[PDB]
Amino acid sequence: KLSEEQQHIIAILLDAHHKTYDPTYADFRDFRPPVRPLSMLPHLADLVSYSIQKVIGFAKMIPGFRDLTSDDQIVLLKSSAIEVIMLRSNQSFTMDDMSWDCGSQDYKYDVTDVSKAGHTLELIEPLIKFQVGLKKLNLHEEEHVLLMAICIVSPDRPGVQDAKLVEAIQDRLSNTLQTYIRCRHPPPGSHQLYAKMIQKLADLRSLNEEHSKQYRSLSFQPENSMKLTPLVLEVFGN
Amino acid sequence: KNHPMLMNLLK
Ligand SMILES: CCCC[Si](CCCC)(c1ccc(OC[C@@H](O)CCC(=O)O)c(C)c1)c1ccc(OCC(O)(CC)CC)c(C)c1
Secondary structure (H helix, E strand, O other): OOOHHHHHHHHHHHHHHHHHOOOOOHHHHHOOOOOOOOOOHHHHHHHHHHHHHHHHHHHHOOOOHHHOOHHHHHHHHHHHHHHHHHHHHHHOEEOOOOEEEOOOHHHEEOHHHHHOOOOOHHHHHHHHHHHHHHHHOOOOHHHHHHHHHHHHOOOOOOOOOOHHHHHHHHHHHHHHHHHHHHHHOOOOOOOOHHHHHHHHHHHHHHHHHHHHHHHHHHHOOHHHHOOOOHHHHHHHOO | OOOHHHHHHOO
16 A cells, blocks of 8 residues: 555655754754853754754755745745754653753753743743654654655645645645555554644644744844844744 | 745755
């Protein structure tokens, strides 16, 4: 049932993720140092800016993504970047203390680090719930990279021009994920697994909207915008 | 609006 075109898609996405995710987190030393009001904003701005670069590298390798116009590629990455960052951040998230552990203690982040960057509980608590619920899904890496790709190529993102071409690319990844779960994910973990993953995509839209609200409020202060990066200002807005 | 840094990373 899992066609070889579908196995091929999964292998490309696996290779793309492994090429764009460094579990050593060695590049974190080039960021501005973590400082523990808004003391974590410079470090977290560099972290997001770095992650945006990785999401772009991953997205470029999604089968069919390049067939979109540069405009459609830009609006999809602009809209999806923070959601893909939320998804890929789950690999470092640990449920033993509800934190993102990236090796050393300096690069072990909790909720107080998010608040020390300007963000409130309106985002922080739904974000932790999302990370816990995503972790509880116990996704195969095949399902994890498929979910990130499906997230990016969504035809209902604002500013999308060729929605039907975006929909065709997503449908090929969607049928690949649906078929993968039925053939390669054994019960009971497979139970309604596709439905639970699509629900996480809905949660990501909600988390995206709340982060945009707080980002727009935080970046409205030039004193805060000064500590951001040029890439973050371009992608997330001025 | 133009996104030159995004466009460059998209190579
Ligand atoms: C303290 C960090 C909290 C967890 Si974050 C969960 C994402 C939630 C949005 C997170 C992001 C990336 C990441 O890196 C893993 C891989 O991407 C890199 C591996 C690789 O690619 O090699 C990790 C580990 C965690 C987070 C980050 C910045 C945030 O502020 C952003 C901003 O709004 C502040 C005003 C604008 C700058 C907020 C609010 C949360």
